[PDB]
Amino acid sequence: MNGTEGPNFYVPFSNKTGVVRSPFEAPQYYLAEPWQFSMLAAYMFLLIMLGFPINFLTLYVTVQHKKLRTPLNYILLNLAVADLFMVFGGFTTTLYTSLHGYFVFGPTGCNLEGFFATLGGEIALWSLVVLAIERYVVVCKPRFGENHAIMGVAFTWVMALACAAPPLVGWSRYIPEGMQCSCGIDYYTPHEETNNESFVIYMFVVHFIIPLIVIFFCYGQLVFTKAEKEVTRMVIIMVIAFLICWLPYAGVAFYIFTHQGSDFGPIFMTIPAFFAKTSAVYNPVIYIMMNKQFRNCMVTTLC
Amino acid sequence: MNGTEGPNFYVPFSNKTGVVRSPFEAPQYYLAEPWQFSMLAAYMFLLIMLGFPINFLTLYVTVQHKKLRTPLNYILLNLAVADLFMVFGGFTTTLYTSLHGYFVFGPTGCNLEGFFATLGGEIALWSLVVLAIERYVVVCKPRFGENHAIMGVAFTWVMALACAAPPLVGWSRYIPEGMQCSCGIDYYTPHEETNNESFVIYMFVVHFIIPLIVIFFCYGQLVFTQKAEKEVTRMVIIMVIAFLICWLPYAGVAFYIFTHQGSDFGPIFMTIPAFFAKTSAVYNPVIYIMMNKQFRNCMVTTLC
Ligand SMILES: *[C@@H]1O[C@H](CO)[C@@H](O[C@@H]2O[C@H](CO)[C@@H](O)[C@H](O)[C@H]2NC(C)=O)[C@H](O)[C@H]1NC(C)=O
Ligand SMILES: *[C@@H]1O[C@H](CO)[C@@H](O[C@@H]2O[C@H](CO)[C@@H](O)[C@H](O)[C@H]2NC(C)=O)[C@H](O)[C@H]1NC(C)=O
Ligand SMILES: CCCCCCCC/C=C/CCCCCCCC(=O)OC[C@H](O)CO
Ligand SMILES: CCCCCCCC/C=C/CCCCCCCC(=O)OC[C@H](O)CO
Ligand SMILES: CCCCCCCC/C=C/CCCCCCCC(=O)OC[C@H](O)CO
Ligand SMILES: *C/C=C(C)/C=C/C=C(C)/C=C/C1=C(C)CCCC1(C)C
Ligand SMILES: *C/C=C(C)/C=C/C=C(C)/C=C/C1=C(C)CCCC1(C)C
Ligand SMILES: *C(=O)CCCCCCCCCCCCCCC
Ligand SMILES: *[C@@H]1O[C@H](CO)[C@@H](O)[C@H](O)[C@H]1NC(C)=O
Ligand SMILES: *[C@@H]1O[C@H](CO)[C@@H](O)[C@H](O)[C@H]1NC(C)=O
Ligand SMILES: CCCCCCCCCCCC(=O)O
């Protein structure tokens, strides 16, 4: 093993010289210079200060205007609430942690940071499943109304909780990653007490591979068979934007899971882990650019 | 003296324990925690990421619409330009300085950080002098056209340079302040080789007190003596109020230090006014959007 395993952490840095200290106890300056932890905090402050208003505005505009009740409108309203949970539930801990260079809040802070980002990202993924089914129904007509949209919204939360909640209560766990200033699923240690390996296989299959299979089946039908054109185009971009956001993190996590103990440093997971946190801001941006109706309503309300 | 004087710095920290090091050589962690320096860097990062777009958009809209050629439009276009100089010329040094906790660029970065913020602040202050005179001529009718607006624009740069430039070339000097991650004028040392004392008086009289006298003279003439003009007059009042909120605490603390050199103050004493004043690069286009119906709709047209 080329890293240091503690009771509830795995530092990607050898302790042969004795300088490794727990990410729940002391700043992690032995593995990165202070100016690197500061860049993480500046990045996290930007996401909070952009993520809070753009998601709140999306929530407010949709609630005020009764014309915005299509399945897309409900799903984007759902993402806005989910994004707001990421910003205030998780990103506030990310910022405070990155300011001090360790999880001052201890494992409670790690649970907060990991759970809300895992929950929010899984809400996004299962929402794309809902939109792919809705597009496949509307376009290929083998109707999808408000009741089916609200049922999909509730469905995303149940599926997201089925992924995010178990690591809080003893099936796997949230553990610091990279420079130890963000948290994720434990791909690093076997840790039979929480049965880590069975959860990782459960997460990639049920919560990463099955949703993609559904999405690309519906897209397979759409391809291989003008208001609706606009919605379909935006969902195409939502799928692409999701894949850019999460594939680097998913790929590196799976590499670590299959190469536990191998030689990797703190930067290896840090960059994908913090890049994935743009997940809380990007979906409303696509909304404004690619929905004429919502953009007009937002300019109406804001002006 | 309760601080430490070096050849080109004044650290508001006692070296009676030997820990003080030059802010051009080593991180200043001995006077503040690293998380404190991280907050300055995150603060400056937000200012850069908001400052560039909202000022570039203000520039782009004004140029793209020939209808925006009133004196107010010219003065706000001039401010957007000066703000961009602040963001790219000075704020980039501030962010890099804050990330490492000291002026890695040495005194040259300090010159960049202080000069562009002093220039942008003085362009704004003299812009309000030009706006107050314009409102006085327009409303009191004692005609202010495009020629006078453009002449006012050049006048603001001349007066701002007369304030920002001398510290670059031997009259006073730019010097780190607070936690040593931004720079201002030397109110800390006599340093008579640069004739510091004479400059501080000149800066506060010609470039502080005189502009305020003109502004409040023109305002008083307005008070103790149609709808389109009322909108502009209202925004000019808020611009002046915003300037005082942004810059009065810094000037007051700076003048207290000038009159109490070597007195018992710490790094936090100037840090907060110094970095709060760096909002000067952002707020003016925000008032413009909120308080000019014509410009706001021109921007929505451009943006959509
Ligand atoms: C990294 O190695 C050092 C050195 O072995 C560990 O520090 C020692 O921990 C033991 C047990 O608490 C103490 O008895 C020693 O006094 C410590 N030595 C020093 C020099 O502090 C350290 O705990 C290790 N880090 C991790 C995360 O395991
Ligand atoms: C603050 O005091 C310390 C301690 O006297 C100074 O450090 C000494 O500086 C001299 C001259 O630069 C060196 O010859 C010594 O080797 C230094 N001693 C130590 C222990 O480092 C330091 O220069 C002072 N700081 C300032 C800004 O004047
Ligand atoms: C694990 C628990 C899962 C949930 C269990 C719920 C209770 C059982 C459901 C019965 C279906 C009864 C109604 C079936 C209606 C099907 C047709 C339909 O929904 O049509 C809508 C219509 O098109 C207008 O939008
Ligand atoms: C902690 C985990 C929680 C997980 C569970 C989350 C469930 C979210 C669903 C809420 C539906 C609320 C009711 C919304 C009703 C809207 C009605 C509407 O707008 O349309 C009415 C129309 O008549 C229709 O046909
Ligand atoms: C459709 C749009 C897609 C857009 C997104 C494209 C993403 C491309 C990269 C994926 C990450 C793959 C991770 C693979 C990790 C292997 C790392 C490795 O082998 O590194 C060994 C080394 O020892 C370690 O330090
Ligand atoms: C900084 C916060 C981080 C890195 C949160 C991590 C969250 C996960 C472990 C999420 C897992 C996945 C998704 C939400 C979508 C893509 C597929 C998964 C299972 C890798
Ligand atoms: C962080 C950057 C700083 C602190 C820049 C400092 C700028 C000045 C020294 C500005 C001076 C003044 C104005 C521009 C307006 C108010 C009067 C002065 C002289 C205090
Ligand atoms: C309503 O009357 C008009 C409202 C116009 C709002 C446009 C303001 C946009 C300012 C730029 C924001 C940049 C933030 C993102 C930086 C990465
Ligand atoms: C540690 O790194 C070395 C060098 O890459 C590698 O040979 C070894 O397999 C790694 N350890 C584990 C447990 O993978
Ligand atoms: C230093 O601080 C003490 C305590 O207030 C004060 O008496 C002394 O005059 C100060 N020195 C200078 C040079 O102001
Ligand atoms: C402008 C887009 C930049 C794209 C950044 C991709 C982030 C993931 C990089 C993965 C590198 C690593 O394994 O550490």
Author numbering:
A (entry chain A): 402 to 543, 548 to 630, 646 to 723
B (entry chain B): 402 to 543, 548 to 630, 645 to 723
Sentences from the paper on this structure:
To characterize the structure of Batho-Rh, we collected TR-SFX data at the Swiss and Japanese XFELs from LCP-grown microcrystals of rhodopsin photoactivated under a regime in which laser-induced heating is low and in which we recovered high-quality difference electron density maps below the maximum activation using a femtosecond-pump laser with a 480-nm wavelength for three time delays of photoactivation of ∆t = 1 ps, 10 ps and 100 ps. The rhodopsin structure, 100 ps later, reveals a slightly more relaxed conformation. The tilt of the C20 methyl increases to 51.3° by ∆t = 100 ps. For the shorter time delay, changes in electron density are distributed in a highly anisotropic manner, clustering in the immediate vicinity of the buried retinal chromophore and propagating towards the cytoplasmic side of the protein through the TM5 and TM6 helices at a minimum speed of 18 Å ps−1 measured along TM6 (1,800 m s−1, slightly above the speed of sound in water and in accordance with the speed of sound in ribonuclease A crystals). This structural anisotropy had completely decayed by Δt = 100 ps. As mammalian rhodopsin evolves along its reaction pathway, some of the observed changes will become more pronounced while others will revert. By Δt = 10 and 100 ps, the β-ionone ring and C19–C20 methyl groups still interact respectively with Gly1213.36–Glu1223.37 and the tyrosines of the Glu181ECL2 polar cage (Fig. 3e,f and Extended Data Fig. 7 (top)), while, for example, Tyr2686.51 and Pro2676.50 of TM6 relax to their initial positions. Already by this early stage of activation, the twisted retinal is freed from many of its interactions with the binding pocket while structural perturbations radiate away as a transient anisotropic breathing motion that is almost entirely decayed by 100 ps.
